[PDB]
Structure formats: structure tokens, C-alpha cells
Amino acid sequence: MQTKIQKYAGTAMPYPNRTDGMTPFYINHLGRHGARFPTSRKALDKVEKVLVSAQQENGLTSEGMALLSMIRRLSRLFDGQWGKLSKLGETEQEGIAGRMIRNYPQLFSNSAKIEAIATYVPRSINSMDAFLSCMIRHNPALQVQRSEGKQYNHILRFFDLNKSYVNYKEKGDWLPIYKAFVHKKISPVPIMKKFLLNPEQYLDKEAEEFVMALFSVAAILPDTSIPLNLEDLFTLDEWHRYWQTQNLRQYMSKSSAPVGKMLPVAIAWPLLSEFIRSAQEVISGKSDYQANFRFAHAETVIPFVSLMGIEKTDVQVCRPDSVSVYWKDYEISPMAANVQWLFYRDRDQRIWVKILLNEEAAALPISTACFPYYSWEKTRIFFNQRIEMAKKTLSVFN
């Protein structure tokens, strides 16, 4: 239902459009913050610098002059706004919250209790608040515990706390593979021709950096609620190629790529452990929360989803050029990406669990006679094995 052009924004794609009587007794949630502003001015500055230099040397086409003017505008509009949750992101959360309460009103009825946590990052806290405000508007009699901060780094920001992973992310063996893939997929000259006279005068490296920075600026704009669009700076095929390179970057640096040896995935086990613990506590009656919500990041969601072993999000593809066929970032971690575990009790008091990834039922590599419902016992056992495997992985890269 999403357009190809939307998809090619990858993890910058805005949350997609989501507009049997089974009623769950508990929901276990993890969501990325909603649509945000760019976090860094680096790409913008790079584009501006190249254009200003060309302008001083009379090297701009008319379209280039136009682009420069537009780039200066964005610089003004982004000023002081870096990394913030946009109006669109607030509305994404309201929609997710709203569909949840509409789908399962009994769960949030009367004096139901919910807890929410977030990282210390403002856009995640603001996302939590957009979400909680909706819940409370629908049922003010909810009891709500709201907390956030670095105390949750171990479960929400594990990607900052593992030294081996940090090193891998910064300078691991995925880097040269990514760089060569970009060199193969991205042809800067046709693009820069649009904006600059004598584009063939540019060194391949400066030309590539310019084009890559430009894609980055274009890709984030639909997340900002600013009524400006730059999708037409590039052809559909150029977007497709850009998307392939960034998709590979995400897969290799944050997911199940063989070059990563599952290190990027294994680091998420504390969050999977926490999910199981909170569900177990509700199930036993030690806790009587109706839902636990958690607000964090793409860097939280991607490895978490792979560690769960959902669908083929943990596929290990040897061939870089085959990755995009089997693993798609925009399907896993768009803006506002979320995972929900819905728990049910049947008439025989047996506990079942449904996993939703971006509000669509997800499959696990275990059997069930009633998909999309899985036996909680089987599921927990499976997840506990994933955690054990994760610890084993980390013990080798310690």
C-alpha cells in the first residue's frame, strides 16, 4: 500500500498507513519514537558547501541555484530543531495508541494500570507522551506510571553499552563492504549534472559524498511536517539504488549479516529478557499491569526484532547484492516502528501470544495449529534459547 518512493526512504519512511473478538489480558510493547527531524546538520552543510563553492565559481545550473536557495531555507527551518519529534510523529503515536484502545477497549477499561518507559532522548520521551496523552484522553481513569532516563540504558540503549559492538559499528569489517557497494550502485555524474556545470570535473569521492548527502537531506524531509518535498531531485531508479545501499548498511551494522557474526543482534538479549520477565510477572499475578510500553530507537528495534527471530528478519545472507531481496529495513523499522505482544487466556486457562510487527501479525519459526496465535510456553522456551545463544555469541566477542 506504500509507494515505492516512500519505501526507498528506508528507516526514514514515515509509519505506514494502518487505517475476531479475541480480547487480550496484557500487552507488551516496544516502539521507536515517531517521525523526527534530522539529527545532524552534516549532510545539509556538505550540500550547501558544494553549491556555494560552485556559485562563487559560476558553476551552477539554474536548477542548482534553485537547489541552493531551497537548501538555505531548510537550514533556517531546521535551526534549533535537530532531532525533535515532529507533528507527524506525534500523530503517528496517537494513531498507534488509538487503534490499540479501539481494538481492545476492555483491556484499558475502568481502572486498568499501564506503565511506560523511555530513553533519555527527548524525541522518545515526547513520543511516550503523545502516546500516553491519547490513552488518558480515551480513559482518564487509567493508572499510569511514567518514567524515563539513563537507568534504562541497559535494556533500551544496549547498542551504546557493549564495547565490542561499538567498535564493530565504528570500524568493523562491514565498512569496506558497504563502501564498495555504494561505489557500485551510485553514479553521481547524472545527478550532479542537473545542478552543476562540468560535473565530470569532480573527483569520484567528492561527487559521491555530495550525492549521498543530498539523498539524506531528501529522505528525511517527509518526516518533518514541513510542506516541502525533494523526491524529484532523483529518478525512481536512483532512489532504488540509494535505498539498496542504506538497507545494506542497516543490515550489516545493526542486524544478522554474516559479517557481523550475530554480534549486532546478540546485544539485544537484555530487552528480550525484560519482555519475558514482565509478561511472566503479569501471568503469575505478581504484577497486575495491563500493559507495558517502552519508547526508544531504530537501534533498539532492529536487533530486538532479529533476536526474536520474527519472519526472516534474522536471515544471514552471504551475498551483499542479495540482501535487499530477503531483508527490508522499511518493513522492520520505519518511523514509529513498534512490536506488540498480545497475551490471551482461553477457556481452559491456556495462555496464547500474538506478535505484531508494525501492527501486522508476525510469524515465528515454531509451529501452531491456530496462526497467528502461538503457545506462550513454546514461545517462551524458544525466546529463552535465543537469549542463551545471544549470551554465547557475546562471550566470544567479549
Residue numbers in the entry: 20 to 38, 46 to 424
What do the study authors state?
The crystal structure (diffraction data were collected on beamlines I02 and I24 at the Diamond Light Source, UK) of BtMinpp expressed in Escherichia coli as an N-terminal 6 × His fusion protein was solved at pH 5.0 by SAD using phases from a selenomethionyl derivative. Refinement against native data at 1.93 Å resolution gave a final structural model with an Rcryst of 16.6% (Rfree 21.3%) and excellent geometry. A single inorganic phosphate group is bound at the active sites of both molecular copies of BtMinpp in the crystallographic asymmetric unit, presumably scavenged from the phosphate buffer used during purification of the enzyme. Comparison of the structures of analog- and phosphate-bound forms revealed an rmsd of 0.20 Å for Cα atoms suggesting limited conformational changes occur between the two states. Moreover, we rationalize the catalytic activity and evolutionary conservation of BtMinpp by mutagenic studies and by an atomic-level description of the structure of this enzyme at 1.9 Å resolution.
